Amino acid sequence: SMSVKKPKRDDSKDLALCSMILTEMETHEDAWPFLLPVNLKLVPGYKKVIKKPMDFSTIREKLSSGQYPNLETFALDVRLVFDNCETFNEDDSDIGRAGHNMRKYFEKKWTDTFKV
């Protein structure tokens, strides 16, 4: 509260570390569904159903331009990619599997980097 803060957890390297995680995300073999925004003119249903589209390129641009106030808003956008993928894709599809795989890969990197 006013004049009462817990000790400052060091956040100076967060930007760089989130960038590194994102690079690892971008270069994963199963990232292909997520690299660019879904083409809303070419994918029937997507626009109406998915209220907040997100993709890796959009996250990279937001990151590079200071649009994440903190590491948690970054993780919210990453998770949004996978949440959308689950909303739109059957688990037993290539893309549904890719999303589960990428979520798993992300969350380990996330824990190991910021919670281990």
Question: In terms of C-beta density within 10 A (0-12 exposed, 13-18 middle, 19 or more buried), how is residue 63 classed?
Answer: middle
Task: Select from 95, 101, 105, 114 the one that contacts ligand 2LW (CB under 6 A).
Answer: 95
Q: Would you say 81 and 46 are in contact if contact means Cβ atoms under 8 Å apart? A: no
Helices (H) and strands (E) in the chain, counts: 5, 0
Q: Which residue reads 């808003």 in tokens?
A: 73
Does position 31 interact with ligand 2LW (CB under 6 A)? The reply is no
**Amino acid in the structure at residue 12:** S
Indicate the SS3 state at residue 63.
helix
Judged by CB under 6 A, the stretch of 3-11, 13-21, 32-40, 59-67 that binds ligand 2LW is 32-40
Q: Which of 20, 23, 32, 49 binds ligand 2LW (CB under 6 A)?
A: 32
Q: Which residue number, 101 or 113, has a Cβ lying nearer to ligand 2LW?
A: 101
Residue carrying the six token digits 């893309």: 95
- Is residue 58 close enough to count as binding ligand 2LW by CB under 6 A? no
Q: Is 22 in the site for ligand 2LW (CB under 6 A)?
A: no
Q: Does 19 bind ligand 2LW (CB under 6 A)?
A: no
Residues that bind ligand 2LW (CB under 6 A): 32-34, 38, 43, 85, 88-89, 95
